[PDB]
Design a protein around this motif. Structure first.
Motif, PDB file in Angstrom:
ATOM      1  N   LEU A 405     -57.813 -10.155   2.296  1.00 20.40           N
ATOM      2  CA  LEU A 405     -56.438 -10.565   1.848  1.00 20.40           C
ATOM      3  C   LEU A 405     -56.345 -12.190   2.333  1.00 20.40           C
ATOM      4  O   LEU A 405     -56.973 -12.476   3.060  1.00 20.40           O
ATOM      5  CB  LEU A 405     -55.941 -10.712   3.517  1.00 20.40           C
ATOM      6  N   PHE A 410     -56.316 -16.312   5.402  1.00 22.34           N
ATOM      7  CA  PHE A 410     -56.633 -16.442   6.595  1.00 22.34           C
ATOM      8  C   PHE A 410     -58.143 -16.064   7.424  1.00 22.34           C
ATOM      9  O   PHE A 410     -57.969 -15.434   8.402  1.00 22.34           O
ATOM     10  CB  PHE A 410     -55.789 -15.201   6.372  1.00 22.34           C
ATOM     11  N   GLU A 437     -59.770 -14.723  22.548  1.00 17.40           N
ATOM     12  CA  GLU A 437     -59.198 -14.764  21.838  1.00 17.40           C
ATOM     13  C   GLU A 437     -58.308 -13.571  22.204  1.00 17.40           C
ATOM     14  O   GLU A 437     -56.899 -12.906  22.130  1.00 17.40           O
ATOM     15  CB  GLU A 437     -59.041 -13.858  20.053  1.00 17.40           C
ATOM     16  N   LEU A 441     -54.613 -12.987  23.586  1.00 15.35           N
ATOM     17  CA  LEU A 441     -53.043 -12.171  22.737  1.00 15.35           C
ATOM     18  C   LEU A 441     -52.663 -10.607  23.724  1.00 15.35           C
ATOM     19  O   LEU A 441     -51.599 -10.614  23.380  1.00 15.35           O
ATOM     20  CB  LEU A 441     -53.922 -11.720  21.529  1.00 15.35           C
ATOM     21  N   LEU A 449     -44.712 -13.347  17.429  1.00 13.43           N
ATOM     22  CA  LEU A 449     -45.739 -13.128  17.529  1.00 13.43           C
ATOM     23  C   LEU A 449     -46.026 -12.183  16.962  1.00 13.43           C
ATOM     24  O   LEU A 449     -46.320 -11.025  17.770  1.00 13.43           O
ATOM     25  CB  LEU A 449     -46.504 -13.809  18.973  1.00 13.43           C
ATOM     26  N   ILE A 450     -47.104 -12.700  16.623  1.00 11.02           N
ATOM     27  CA  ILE A 450     -48.236 -11.526  15.749  1.00 11.02           C
ATOM     28  C   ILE A 450     -48.876 -10.445  16.379  1.00 11.02           C
ATOM     29  O   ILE A 450     -49.489 -10.943  17.509  1.00 11.02           O
ATOM     30  CB  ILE A 450     -49.301 -12.369  15.053  1.00 11.02           C
ATOM     31  N   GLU A 465     -51.100  -5.906  12.352  1.00 10.45           N
ATOM     32  CA  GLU A 465     -49.549  -6.092  11.180  1.00 10.45           C
ATOM     33  C   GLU A 465     -49.488  -6.236  10.327  1.00 10.45           C
ATOM     34  O   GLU A 465     -49.956  -7.404  10.289  1.00 10.45           O
ATOM     35  CB  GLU A 465     -48.149  -6.346  11.434  1.00 10.45           C
ATOM     36  N   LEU A 466     -49.090  -6.015   8.484  1.00 11.24           N
ATOM     37  CA  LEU A 466     -49.669  -6.079   7.663  1.00 11.24           C
ATOM     38  C   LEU A 466     -48.467  -6.673   6.960  1.00 11.24           C
ATOM     39  O   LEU A 466     -46.915  -6.108   7.238  1.00 11.24           O
ATOM     40  CB  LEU A 466     -49.898  -5.794   6.453  1.00 11.24           C
ATOM     41  N   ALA A 467     -48.343  -8.398   7.219  1.00 14.99           N
ATOM     42  CA  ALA A 467     -47.299  -8.998   6.325  1.00 14.99           C
ATOM     43  C   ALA A 467     -47.506  -8.473   5.086  1.00 14.99           C
ATOM     44  O   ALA A 467     -48.081  -8.876   4.472  1.00 14.99           O
ATOM     45  CB  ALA A 467     -47.386  -9.900   6.773  1.00 14.99           C
ATOM     46  N   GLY A 470     -46.957 -11.520   2.849  1.00 12.56           N
ATOM     47  CA  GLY A 470     -47.076 -13.131   2.509  1.00 12.56           C
ATOM     48  C   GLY A 470     -47.064 -13.933   4.049  1.00 12.56           C
ATOM     49  O   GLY A 470     -46.697 -13.297   4.463  1.00 12.56           O
ATOM     50  N   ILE A 507     -48.995 -22.702  26.742  1.00 14.29           N
ATOM     51  CA  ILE A 507     -49.876 -22.487  25.929  1.00 14.29           C
ATOM     52  C   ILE A 507     -48.859 -23.642  24.831  1.00 14.29           C
ATOM     53  O   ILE A 507     -47.791 -23.478  24.667  1.00 14.29           O
ATOM     54  CB  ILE A 507     -49.807 -21.148  24.577  1.00 14.29           C
ATOM     55  N   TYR A 509     -50.950 -24.674  21.545  1.00 14.71           N
ATOM     56  CA  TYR A 509     -50.529 -23.875  20.252  1.00 14.71           C
ATOM     57  C   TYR A 509     -50.590 -25.095  19.331  1.00 14.71           C
ATOM     58  O   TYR A 509     -49.213 -25.438  18.459  1.00 14.71           O
ATOM     59  CB  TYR A 509     -49.493 -23.114  19.837  1.00 14.71           C
ATOM     60  N   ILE A 532     -45.466 -15.905  14.135  1.00 16.08           N
ATOM     61  CA  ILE A 532     -46.524 -16.721  14.243  1.00 16.08           C
ATOM     62  C   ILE A 532     -47.652 -16.105  14.458  1.00 16.08           C
ATOM     63  O   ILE A 532     -48.099 -15.564  15.586  1.00 16.08           O
ATOM     64  CB  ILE A 532     -45.942 -18.266  14.450  1.00 16.08           C
ATOM     65  N   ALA A 533     -49.014 -17.340  13.834  1.00 12.94           N
ATOM     66  CA  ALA A 533     -50.621 -16.535  13.991  1.00 12.94           C
ATOM     67  C   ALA A 533     -51.493 -17.995  13.785  1.00 12.94           C
ATOM     68  O   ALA A 533     -51.358 -18.810  13.644  1.00 12.94           O
ATOM     69  CB  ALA A 533     -50.586 -15.669  13.018  1.00 12.94           C
ATOM     70  N   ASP A 534     -52.340 -17.768  14.076  1.00  7.30           N
ATOM     71  CA  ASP A 534     -53.826 -18.532  14.580  1.00  7.30           C
ATOM     72  C   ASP A 534     -54.712 -17.428  13.946  1.00  7.30           C
ATOM     73  O   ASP A 534     -55.175 -16.767  14.770  1.00  7.30           O
ATOM     74  CB  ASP A 534     -53.958 -19.002  15.764  1.00  7.30           C
TER      75      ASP A 534
HETATM   76  C1  LIG Z   1     -55.671 -10.188  11.241  1.00  4.43           C
HETATM   77  C2  LIG Z   1     -55.280 -11.594  12.208  1.00  4.43           C
HETATM   78  C3  LIG Z   1     -56.457 -11.732  13.726  1.00  4.43           C
HETATM   79  C4  LIG Z   1     -55.910 -12.631  14.582  1.00  4.43           C
HETATM   80  C5  LIG Z   1     -54.355 -12.975  14.047  1.00  4.43           C
HETATM   81  C6  LIG Z   1     -53.953 -14.357  15.508  1.00  4.43           C
HETATM   82  O1  LIG Z   1     -52.571 -14.618  14.921  1.00  4.43           O
HETATM   83  N1  LIG Z   1     -54.050 -13.877  16.736  1.00  4.43           N
HETATM   84  C7  LIG Z   1     -53.687 -14.989  17.818  1.00  4.43           C
HETATM   85  C8  LIG Z   1     -54.261 -15.472  18.156  1.00  4.43           C
HETATM   86  C9  LIG Z   1     -53.798 -16.409  19.402  1.00  4.43           C
HETATM   87  C10 LIG Z   1     -52.408 -16.610  19.254  1.00  4.43           C
HETATM   88  C11 LIG Z   1     -52.051 -17.944  19.955  1.00  4.43           C
HETATM   89  N2  LIG Z   1     -52.107 -20.509  20.243  1.00  4.43           N
HETATM   90  C12 LIG Z   1     -53.097 -19.892  19.277  1.00  4.43           C
HETATM   91  C13 LIG Z   1     -53.180 -21.317  19.581  1.00  4.43           C
HETATM   92  N3  LIG Z   1     -53.859 -21.703  20.466  1.00  4.43           N
HETATM   93  C14 LIG Z   1     -54.493 -22.735  20.233  1.00  4.43           C
HETATM   94  C15 LIG Z   1     -52.965 -21.406  21.422  1.00  4.43           C
HETATM   95  C16 LIG Z   1     -53.444 -19.912  21.622  1.00  4.43           C
HETATM   96  C17 LIG Z   1     -51.976 -16.472  18.188  1.00  4.43           C
HETATM   97  C18 LIG Z   1     -50.031 -16.890  18.348  1.00  4.43           C
HETATM   98  F1  LIG Z   1     -50.268 -17.986  17.727  1.00  4.43           F
HETATM   99  F2  LIG Z   1     -49.453 -15.774  17.023  1.00  4.43           F
HETATM  100  F3  LIG Z   1     -49.558 -16.771  19.392  1.00  4.43           F
HETATM  101  C19 LIG Z   1     -52.042 -15.544  17.219  1.00  4.43           C
HETATM  102  C20 LIG Z   1     -53.826 -12.971  12.928  1.00  4.43           C
HETATM  103  C21 LIG Z   1     -54.091 -12.081  11.835  1.00  4.43           C
HETATM  104  C22 LIG Z   1     -53.316 -11.819  10.865  1.00  4.43           C
HETATM  105  C23 LIG Z   1     -52.600 -12.133   9.704  1.00  4.43           C
HETATM  106  C24 LIG Z   1     -52.050 -10.986   9.084  1.00  4.43           C
HETATM  107  C25 LIG Z   1     -51.082 -10.444   8.272  1.00  4.43           C
HETATM  108  N4  LIG Z   1     -50.837  -9.935   6.989  1.00  4.43           N
HETATM  109  C26 LIG Z   1     -50.663 -10.543   6.690  1.00  4.43           C
HETATM  110  N5  LIG Z   1     -50.436 -10.800   4.796  1.00  4.43           N
HETATM  111  N6  LIG Z   1     -50.607 -11.925   4.571  1.00  4.43           N
HETATM  112  C27 LIG Z   1     -50.792 -12.358   5.548  1.00  4.43           C
HETATM  113  C28 LIG Z   1     -51.330 -11.785   6.407  1.00  4.43           C
HETATM  114  C29 LIG Z   1     -52.142 -12.206   7.431  1.00  4.43           C
END
Ligand SMILES: Cc1ccc(C(=O)Nc2ccc(CN3CCN(C)CC3)c(C(F)(F)F)c2)cc1C#Cc1cnc2[nH]ncc2c1
Lengths: 957, 112
Positions: A405, A410, A437, A441, A449-450, A465-467, A470, A507, A509, A532-534
């Motif tokens: 992906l 990513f 993590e 989450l 938030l993802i 979820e599949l964005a 992209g 948090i 981020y 938003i993702a990480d």
């Molecule tokens: C496969 C996958 C696993 C995990 C995550 C994730 O993000 N986890 C995650 C963890 C922690 C935090 C909160 N924070 C972060 C900053 N820390 C410092 C403090 C806390 C966050 C958030 F920031 F979100 F809160 C998100 C995203 C994807 C994904 C995906 C994906 C889905 N669909 C798609 N399409 N094309 C591409 C593509 C990619």
């Protein structure tokens, strides 16, 4: 350099200091500030009493464990005259880093040997810091460098320290009056009292970690058998000093879904209802001179969750405060049969086994086994929420670099399927990273938030979820055509709504960037567009906390307003369409002073406004220029009346190239355009105070002439025929073909009123107009059809307003007329000649947030049953004509409103032009999107639906 | 005396219409001479706006202040000079401030 003296209690530190809280003194030699060492813990001097031999040498390791940047330590044994030789030999046997050893003037020479505008400040200041007399270069701008210099040198902060601060160890309700409210403690420092104690590990948001004793109280567990208790013992060589205060601090936010909380210096016991509890006391084992922090939990679900939380807190403390232990060794206890002695394994074993399976096979009894989750329910994530464990029969996953992906941008994330729907799978090649993590989450449920769908164990994966579209980065770089203004605003709004959610959850981020913005759709009116993702795998960060996040979001909003690209103006640099109120927000967030940046809630509130979206331009004309009327051709013609002679101004709506020229000997009050397709030309007619109608060719300014002069001031113009309304109550009708003729006479002159009643407005639906207190209508023969006397409106409203001049009239189905210096707009029935409605601008302005006047200055109308009303102050009331309800109150742009009208730009986009005043006086032009009420309603619905969804996901979890 | 939906007292209406008898009888019975509506208009404000000299006189004799500011910051001198100057003279005979400024920084002799 600084010399600091530490050691065991009673070791003779001050005795050595004479022979050479934490009180500080000055010792010249290489002049050194010396501290006599507790709270919150150069050259180190380690002092110990030789009378206890190695017994005194042991337990000194925390002194090496505790903020040094590999600074030297000198070890000295004191009271040699009262010590035995075998104790000294044991001390030799025992021996961050120790440089040399001594056992008692050798100490002072050793200290000297190991201790061997240029910031000339803090001399007068020590005995608001700018100019105490500007020292150095602008007092180093009071930058954090100066603060660190003054704190490290121990000159400014330790006035109260060891005298008032940190005295609560032996001395917040019923606390301040004995600690920091004795003689002179102003109420300005309530927020600092019992807060600086928190930073120094002296007080906890529960409490001084000194009233606790080292005698463990009586502990009773509702469970006693081996098969029903999970026991985890992390063993650490030393419990690096300061450990228990932080541990007692953090082990409060522990939840199985704190009725009883016992604690002492080394140990806490948390108790919910039975089959829910945790003892995290410290045990001492025979013939094991190490620290044993033991955790005893019941084997049930709540026991698993509680043990997981406690272990997570302990390793969080290890990673954050005492990295040196990561040595600390973790073990788990088990028993194959009840009554057997508890046996222990390191955690790498049972980890290999959780990877392989879910059973601990006895080496000698192959048929006897224990599930792993009964022994240590953290290696298998038995702490997951019931809807989060992966169902391996519902996951279609291919781990190959063909369904990868984002092409791996990513991280290690692949496309897959989960319960039919297409899904994303991140494969974790440690268990610590996965558990951290997951802990983060499982407590984040918001629309931007993802969302986490599954967390597997045997694969050790995450599935989400599949964005489909992209990330935002690919949207910015690849498909720029679909990045409409509405979509940009929705993306920025969605990111802010969730950056502020993370800040609510405390948090950080750290790094926010376009790559971490995931897009599910490009349809602007959708409920969810960006999350938003990480991925946990640089130009998007503050110069250096929530202010760093605000700076990052300012950069993100800069990179959203611009499609892609100290920091220059985005419109000038990239040529993008102007966007006021977002350029200002970008400048606000990008302030170099952290305390001046808006908070994320304020940033979202700024973004949550339809004034921010549908405000296309805001042009400020040169100062002291007063213009009273405009006509739109795009380009705008303005009538400058800032002096006794009227002038004609030209403003190009694309270049902002304002120009002006003196054209008439009297003030210009009205302007209009005469269009002649039959010749393919156009004239601009200016009606001045002297009564001269002066005509300019717009193609070339040299072709100028003047029509027949009227007997008094010209008040209004309209345009086929040209209608001219003068101040003596006369209407002059010209044929448009006669405008080009110098001195041409009007086709007809019609008297409506008298000298004291001027004709001021003319508009189409049959022609309609207003003069004095009367409304008149005309047919195609330019004859009077009806006159409605509006002084009967004095039977309503008030005579101060009703008995005034008519300044503007608009009509589709009803007469919406406004008077001079009146906040009341009257609504007349053009079919019955009777007053039937009132619209009070003061009434509307009072319902919404001393700087308002409300007197109507102009009106405008749209085909979409919308009425725009400009008040005397800088307020525009947008109303729906269906029920004369209030759609919006635009304000806080300027101080006064002069006139507004609709226009069409060169790009065929309909806009609203509003001319107002910033009342020393600066006239202003404002451009609005013609569909502003619809955007207001749509964004209100969007926010309502999104908030409803957020509440739903918060409730359901 | 009572206020309407717009905060307007009977004295406000009498000042608007210019009824000498109603203003005089309300002031005699004890009407609030300095009451204001949502517009911030006092009896004297309305009298100066409409252009009733004798209403201004009877209000000033009853204790009307010449430094009242409406919602727009306009003193009775502003409304008197804006609509034309016998009322201006009468108000200036009273202790009126000719240097008063409204929200736009305009003195009441600038309106004239
Ligand atoms: C496969 C996958 C696993 C995990 C995550 C994730 O993000 N986890 C995650 C963890 C922690 C935090 C909160 N924070 C972060 C900053 N820390 C410092 C403090 C806390 C966050 C958030 F920031 F979100 F809160 C998100 C995203 C994807 C994904 C995906 C994906 C889905 N669909 C798609 N399409 N094309 C591409 C593509 C990619």
């Amino acid at each position: 350099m600084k010399l600091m003296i530490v050691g065991n209690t009673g070791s003779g530190k001050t005795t050595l200091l004479q022979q050479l809280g934490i009180d500080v003194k000055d010792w010249p030699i290489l002049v050194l500030n010396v501290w006599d060492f507790e709270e919150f813990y150069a050259l180190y001097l380690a002092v110990y009493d030789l009378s206890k031999g190695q017994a005194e040498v042991d337990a000194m390791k925390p002194w090496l464990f505790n903020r040094a940047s590999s600074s030297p330590v000198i070890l000295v044994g004191t009271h040699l005259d009262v010590s035995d030789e075998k104790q000294r030999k044991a001390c030799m046997s025992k021996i961050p880093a120790i440089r040399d050893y001594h056992f008692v003037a050798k100490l002072r020479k050793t200290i000297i040997n190991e201790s061997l505008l240029e910031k000339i400040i803090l001399s007068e200041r020590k005995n608001r810091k700018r100019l105490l007399e500007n020292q150095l270069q602008l007092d180093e701008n009071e930058l954090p460098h100066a603060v660190h210099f003054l704190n490290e040198s121990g000159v400014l902060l330790p006035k109260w320290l060891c005298k008032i601060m940190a005295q609560i160890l032996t001395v917040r309700r019923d606390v301040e009056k004995f600690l920091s409210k004795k003689r002179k403690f102003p109420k300005n420092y309530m927020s600092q009292y019992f807060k600086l104690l928190e930073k120094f590990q002296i007080a906890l948001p529960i409490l001084v970690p000194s009233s606790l004793s080292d005698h463990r109280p009586v502990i009773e567990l509702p469970h006693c058998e081996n098969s029903e208790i999970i026991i985890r013992l992390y063993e650490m060589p030393y419990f690096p000093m300061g450990f228990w205060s932080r541990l007692i601090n953090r082990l409060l936010e522990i939840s199985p879904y704190r009725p009883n909380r016992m604690y002492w210096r080394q140990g806490i016991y948390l108790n919910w209802s039975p089959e829910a509890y945790c003892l995290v006391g410290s045990e001492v084992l025979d013939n094991h001179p190490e620290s044993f922090l033991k955790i005893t939990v019941p084997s049930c679900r709540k026991g698993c969750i509680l043990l997981g939380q406690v272990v997570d807190h302990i390793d969080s403390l290890m990673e954050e405060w005492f990295p040196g232990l990561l040595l600390l060794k973790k073990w788990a206890l088990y028993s194959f049969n009840d009554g057997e002695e508890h046996q222990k394994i390191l955690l790498d074993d049972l980890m290999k086994k959780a990877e392989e399976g879910d059973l601990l096979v006895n080496p000698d009894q192959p048929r006897l086994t224990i599930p792993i989750s009964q022994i240590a329910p953290d290696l298998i994530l038995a702490d997951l929420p019931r809807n989060i464990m992966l169902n391996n029969d519902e996951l279609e996953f291919e781990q190959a670099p063909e369904f990868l992906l984002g092409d791996g941008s990513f991280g290690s994330v692949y496309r897959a399927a989960y319960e039919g729907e297409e899904v994303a799978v991140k494969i974790f090649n440690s268990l610590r990273l996965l558990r951290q993590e997951l802990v983060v989450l499982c407590h984040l449920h918001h629309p931007s938030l993802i969302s986490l769908l599954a967390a597997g164990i045997r694969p050790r994966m995450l599935v989400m979820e599949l964005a489909s579209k992209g990330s935002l980065d690919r949207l910015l770089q690849q498909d720029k055509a679909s990045l409409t203004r509405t979509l940009q605003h929705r993306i920025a709004l969605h990111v802010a709504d969730g950056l502020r959610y993370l800040h609510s959850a405390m948090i950080i981020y750290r790094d926010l960037k376009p790559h971490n913005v995931l897009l599910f759709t490009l349809y602007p009116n959708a409920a969810i567009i960006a999350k938003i993702a990480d991925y946990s795998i640089p130009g998007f960060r503050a110069p250096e906390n929530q202010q760093a996040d605000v700076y990052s979001f300012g950069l993100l909003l800069y990179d959203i307003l611009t499609t892609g690209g100290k920091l220059p103006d985005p419109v000038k640099e990239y040529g993008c369409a102007p966007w006021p109120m977002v350029e200002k927000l970008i400048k606000q967030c990008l302030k170099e002073n952290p305390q001046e940046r808006p908070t994320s809630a304020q940033v979202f509130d700024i973004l949550n406004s339809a004034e921010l979206v549908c405000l296309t331009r805001r042009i400020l004309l040169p100062k002291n220029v007063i213009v009273e009327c405009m006509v739109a051709t795009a380009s705008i013609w303005l009538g400058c009346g800032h002096t006794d002679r009227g002038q004609l101004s030209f403003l190009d709506l694309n270049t902002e190239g304002y120009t002006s020229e003196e054209v008439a000997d009297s003030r210009i009050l009205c302007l209009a355009l005469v269009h002649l397709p039959v010749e393919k030309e156009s004239w601009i007619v200016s009606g001045t105070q002297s009564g001269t109608l002066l005509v300019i060719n717009t193609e070339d300014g040299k072709k100028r002439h003047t029509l027949e002069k009227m007997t008094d001031s010209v008040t209004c113009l309209y345009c086929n025929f040209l209608l001219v309304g003068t101040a003596d109550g006369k209407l002059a009708i010209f044929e448009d073909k006669t405008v080009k003729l110098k001195g041409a006479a009007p086709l007809k002159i019609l008297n409506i009123g008298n000298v004291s009643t001027p004709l001021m407005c003319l508009s189409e639906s049959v022609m309609w107009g207003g003069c004095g207190t009367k409304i008149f209508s005309f047919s195609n023969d330019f004859t009077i059809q009806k006159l409605i006397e509006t002084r009967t409106s004095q039977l309503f409203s008030y005579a101060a307003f009703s008995d005034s001049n008519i300044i503007t009239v608009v009509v589709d189905t009803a007469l919406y007329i406004a008077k001079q210096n009146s906040p009341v707009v009257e609504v007349w029935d053009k079919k019955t000649e009777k007053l039937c409605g009132l619209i009070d601008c003061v009434h509307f302005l009072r319902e919404v947030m001393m700087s308002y006047s409300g007197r109507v200055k102009t009106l405008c109308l749209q085909k979409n049953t919308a009425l725009w009303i400009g008040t005397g102050g800088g307020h525009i009331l947008l109303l729906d004509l269906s029920t004369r309800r209030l759609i919006r109150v635009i304000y806080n742009f300027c101080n006064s409103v002069r006139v507004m009208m609709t226009a069409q730009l060169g790009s065929l986009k309909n806009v609203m032009l509003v001319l107002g005043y910033n009342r020393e006086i600066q006239s202003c032009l404002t451009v609005w999107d013609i569909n502003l009420p619809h955007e207001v309603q749509n964004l209100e619905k969007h926010i309502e639906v999104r908030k409803e969804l957020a509440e739903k996901m918060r409730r359901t979890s | 005396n009572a206020t309407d939906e717009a905060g307007v007292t009977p004295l406000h209406l009498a000042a608007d219409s210019g009824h000498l008898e109603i203003v005089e009888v309300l002031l005699k019975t004890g009407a609030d001479v300095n009451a204001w509506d949502h517009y911030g208009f006092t009896p004297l404000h309305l009298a100066a706006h409409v252009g009733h000299l004798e209403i201004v006189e009877v209000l000033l004799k009853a204790g009307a202040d010449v430094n009242a500011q409406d919602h727009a910051g306009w003193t009775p001198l502003h409304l008197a000079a804006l609509y034309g100057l016998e009322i201006v003279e009468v108000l200036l005979k009273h202790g009126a401030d000719v240097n008063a400024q409204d929200m736009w920084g305009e003195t009441p002799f600038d309106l004239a």
